[PDB]
Structure formats: structure tokens, C-alpha cells
Amino acid sequence: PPMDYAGSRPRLMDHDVTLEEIHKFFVDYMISDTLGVISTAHLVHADRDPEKARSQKCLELANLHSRAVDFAKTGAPAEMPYALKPREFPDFLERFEKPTYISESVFGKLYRAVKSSLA
């Protein structure tokens, strides 16, 4: 079954826009903008933990990603937890400075095949 598509409650003001709260929202968009890291964390967790997209962690990550996508529409921050950070990346990434771990998933096999073909 698909996940619920119900969004957050809209926020309505009691006064018209004075061209200041819009600036506040625009500046606050940079803060707590975790749209680009949720996908990476989900991919890392799927590659590490077997039986991916079945545990509650994947569901929580999907809900957080949906909320982050909805952030551009409604002012609901994603609120990325600290304990959900991967702190590890597979071979098929450009984060050379970050620690690299050998992945044994299908993506790891595909990357190894590509590396062998190139070499």
C-alpha cells in the first residue's frame, strides 16, 4: 500500500503581508534545509541494512523527505534527527574526504563491474 499523502496543517496569518515576514521566510529557508541529505541517508541505510525499504527507519526517512519537499509549499521544517546521520559512504560517491566503506549490494556490484570495464 502507498503512504499517506496528507500534508501539514496550513498556517494562516491574521494580517496582510508587510513585505517583512516574506523576507524572514526567505532567509530562514537556508536554515534547516535538509532536502539533499535525506536521500543520501536513505540510500546508505538501504545499502547497509538488509531487507531495505521494510524497516520503520525507511518509513521515517520517507516521511521526512515528503515533509521536506512540502517545506517549499508550507512552512514545516523537516527536523532532521542527529542520530539518523549515516557517518559512512559507499565507494560510488565523490566524498573522498569522508570515510569510504566497501558496499556489497547491487550498486556495489555494478560499480565494481564499471570499474573493471574501465580498467
Binding site: S8, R11, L12, M13, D14, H15, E79, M80, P81, A83
Partner: protein, 113 residues
């Protein structure tokens, strides 16, 4: 809940209404003196709940209820399930929005719905 003493005999005055005069008047039964009233006020009491005097400390009247607690919601900074939820208005928004306060003594994190 107001009283005044007439200058003629220094005795209490009771309010009365006259149909012909159509104005508030104060006269006492002690002496014969009628005086004009001021502000047309005969009763003014601030509403208070101090009825059970010297009894609210022994028996808990529950004047200030405690906020409810839930365990379904999971905190973000820490992995603690217990949290406090309540409804309150925002700075400028309308309606009631659900809030959450973490119950972990070492977390101290609050977030909205």
C-alpha cells in the same frame, strides 16, 4: 457593594430609584436628606474564585491542571518517546496548533506539529 455617609448626619445611604425623577438618588432613614448620585454606580465587584478560603491547600482543588503526556511521538535530538503535547496560538497565526515538549531531562527540545 458601595456605601457612603451623608454629610447631614453621617449615616449610611441606600440607593433608590424614582420614576418621576428618573435619576439615581441616595437618602438615609436616619435623617431626611436626599443627595444626587455620582457615576450611576450601585455595585462593582471583581469576580474572584476565593470562596473556599483556607481550604485550597489541604484539599487539592486542581486549579491548574497538568499538561497531558504521550509516548507515541518520538523526539528528534534524542530517542525518547515520552513528550508533552498541548494546544496554543502562534505569534501571529490564527487557530490552535499542536505543540510538543520533550520529557527527557537532558534534551530540552520543543517542536511543533
Amino acid at each position: 457593594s458601595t456605601m457612603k455617609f451623608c454629610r447631614e448626619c453621617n449615616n449610611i445611604l441606600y440607593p433608590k430609584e424614582d420614576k418621576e425623577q428618573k435619576i439615581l438618588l441616595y437618602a438615609c432613614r436616619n435623617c431626611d436628606h436626599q443627595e444626587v448620585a455620582d457615576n450611576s454606580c450601585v455595585y462593582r465587584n471583581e469576580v474572584h474564585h476565593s470562596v473556599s478560603e483556607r481550604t485550597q491547600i489541604l484539599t487539592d482543588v486542581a486549579s491548574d491542571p497538568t499538561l497531558p503526556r504521550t509516548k507515541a511521538v518520538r523526539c528528534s535530538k534524542c530517542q525518547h518517546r515520552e513528550a508533552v503535547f498541548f494546544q496554543a496560538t502562534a505569534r501571529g497565526e490564527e487557530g490552535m496548533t499542536l505543540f510538543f515538549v520533550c520529557c527527557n531531562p537532558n534534551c530540552g527540545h520543543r517542536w511543533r506539529e
